[PDB]
Write an enzyme that holds these catalytic residues in place. Structure first.
Site, mmCIF file in Angstrom:
data_model
loop_
_atom_site.group_PDB
_atom_site.id
_atom_site.type_symbol
_atom_site.label_atom_id
_atom_site.label_comp_id
_atom_site.label_asym_id
_atom_site.label_seq_id
_atom_site.Cartn_x
_atom_site.Cartn_y
_atom_site.Cartn_z
ATOM 1 C CG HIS A 1 -0.387 0.272 2.487
ATOM 2 N ND1 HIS A 1 0.086 -0.750 3.278
ATOM 3 C CD2 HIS A 1 -0.141 1.418 3.163
ATOM 4 C CE1 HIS A 1 0.591 -0.245 4.388
ATOM 5 N NE2 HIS A 1 0.478 1.069 4.334
ATOM 6 C CD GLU B 1 -0.736 -4.504 1.777
ATOM 7 O OE1 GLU B 1 -1.621 -4.993 1.056
ATOM 8 O OE2 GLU B 1 -0.425 -3.290 1.730
ATOM 9 N N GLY C 1 2.397 5.292 10.470
ATOM 10 C CA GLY C 1 3.799 5.609 10.275
ATOM 11 C C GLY C 1 4.759 4.443 10.511
ATOM 12 C CB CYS D 1 3.231 0.479 7.090
ATOM 13 S SG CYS D 1 1.607 0.133 7.745
HETATM 14 C C1 LIG Z 1 0.865 1.663 8.324
HETATM 15 C C2 LIG Z 1 0.597 2.610 7.158
HETATM 16 C C3 LIG Z 1 0.216 4.036 7.484
HETATM 17 O O1 LIG Z 1 0.708 4.692 8.391
HETATM 18 O O2 LIG Z 1 -0.792 4.666 6.658
HETATM 19 C C4 LIG Z 1 -1.346 5.930 7.018
HETATM 20 C C5 LIG Z 1 -1.672 6.718 5.770
HETATM 21 C C6 LIG Z 1 -0.485 1.466 9.059
HETATM 22 C C7 LIG Z 1 -0.270 1.018 10.506
HETATM 23 C C8 LIG Z 1 -1.590 0.667 11.202
HETATM 24 C C9 LIG Z 1 -2.563 1.836 11.319
HETATM 25 C C10 LIG Z 1 -3.137 1.744 12.731
HETATM 26 N N1 LIG Z 1 -2.223 0.869 13.428
HETATM 27 C C11 LIG Z 1 -1.356 0.265 12.617
HETATM 28 O O3 LIG Z 1 -0.480 -0.514 12.920
HETATM 29 N N2 LIG Z 1 -1.315 0.560 8.277
HETATM 30 C C12 LIG Z 1 -2.481 0.899 7.704
HETATM 31 O O4 LIG Z 1 -3.009 1.995 7.782
HETATM 32 C C13 LIG Z 1 -3.161 -0.186 6.927
HETATM 33 C C14 LIG Z 1 -3.069 0.274 5.471
HETATM 34 C C15 LIG Z 1 -3.472 -0.731 4.409
HETATM 35 C C16 LIG Z 1 -3.064 -2.064 4.448
HETATM 36 C C17 LIG Z 1 -3.451 -2.943 3.437
HETATM 37 C C18 LIG Z 1 -4.246 -2.501 2.386
HETATM 38 C C19 LIG Z 1 -4.650 -1.172 2.338
HETATM 39 C C20 LIG Z 1 -4.258 -0.292 3.339
HETATM 40 N N3 LIG Z 1 -4.543 -0.461 7.313
HETATM 41 C C21 LIG Z 1 -4.996 -0.748 8.532
HETATM 42 O O5 LIG Z 1 -4.252 -0.777 9.522
HETATM 43 C C22 LIG Z 1 -6.476 -0.975 8.537
HETATM 44 O O6 LIG Z 1 -7.086 -0.572 7.563
HETATM 45 N N4 LIG Z 1 -7.271 -1.551 9.431
HETATM 46 C C23 LIG Z 1 -6.919 -2.145 10.687
HETATM 47 C C24 LIG Z 1 -7.852 -3.314 10.946
HETATM 48 C C25 LIG Z 1 -7.215 -4.512 11.645
HETATM 49 C C26 LIG Z 1 -7.440 -5.380 10.419
HETATM 50 C C27 LIG Z 1 -8.106 -4.197 9.734
#
Ligand SMILES: */C(=C/C(=O)OCC)[C@H](C[C@@H]1CCNC1=O)NC(=O)[C@H](Cc1ccccc1)NC(=O)C(=O)NCC1CCC1
Length: 181
Positions: free
Chosen positions: A41, A72, A146, A148
């Site tokens: 992503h 992913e 932040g 990921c």
């Molecule tokens: C890392 C990416 C980021 O910072 O994006 C901001 C623009 C985050 C870390 C997550 C967010 C909250 N706590 C965390 O550890 N990851 C994401 O935002 C994920 C993005 C994504 C992944 C795959 C496909 C598309 C987008 N998404 C999620 O964390 C989420 O959507 N939902 C959480 C929930 C648990 C299973 C679904």
């Protein structure tokens, strides 16, 4: 200095890089040669910002399993002089669970950051923002935005890449060595 911290600091020094895409800040893992891995992503484009310069991406491969389903992870091949230290021998042949793991993050906003996510268990299916995903593992730690790209490690093994969380738990995409053959 002890050996777990030495391996984690050595990761930071040689293999775990600060990056920015059009989606913002991510941690990138260089695996060998000119091959790295990011979360899908992050949407790396034709170029990517790495530490202090813009690097051209020669090739990107988004990984799906046999079920056609998102893993992913995107493999990027970079246009650089740099050969990464080869860390494929620290990646298990099959996706592996772990006790007392550490997530290593390295971003401009979270530089050289160490997070004790605890035990890492088989989880499997996850739904991230309407994207179904396989081969995930789970840790009971409240990871955050932040983080990921963060590298899940323990006892000299490199077992995942952080992709998600729900405010109470964190989730990585599992690593296996065959991805980087
Ligand atoms: C890392 C990416 C980021 O910072 O994006 C901001 C623009 C985050 C870390 C997550 C967010 C909250 N706590 C965390 O550890 N990851 C994401 O935002 C994920 C993005 C994504 C992944 C795959 C496909 C598309 C987008 N998404 C999620 O964390 C989420 O959507 N939902 C959480 C929930 C648990 C299973 C679904």
């Amino acid at each position: 200095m002890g050996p777990s911290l030495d391996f984690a600091l050595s990761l930071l020094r040689r293999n775990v890089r600060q990056v920015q895409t059009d989606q913002g800040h991510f941690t990138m893992l260089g695996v060998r040669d000119r091959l790295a891995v990011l979360p899908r992503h992050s949407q790396p484009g034709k170029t990517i910002w790495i530490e202090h310069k813009l690097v051209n991406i020669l090739d990107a491969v988004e990984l799906v399993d046999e079920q056609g389903v998102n893993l992913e992870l995107t493999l990027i091949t970079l246009d650089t002089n740099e050969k990464f230290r080869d860390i494929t021998k620290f990646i298990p042949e099959n996706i592996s669970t772990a006790s007392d793991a550490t997530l290593v993050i390295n971003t401009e906003h979270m530089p050289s950051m160490f997070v004790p996510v605890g035990d890492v268990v088989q989880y499997g299916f996850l739904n991230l923002s309407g994207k179904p995903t396989h081969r995930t593992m789970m840790y009971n730690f409240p990871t955050k935005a932040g983080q990921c790209g963060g590298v899940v490690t323990s006892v000299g093994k490199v077992i995942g890449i952080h992709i998600g969380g729900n405010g109470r738990q964190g989730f990585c995409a599992g690593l296996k060595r065959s991805y980087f053959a």
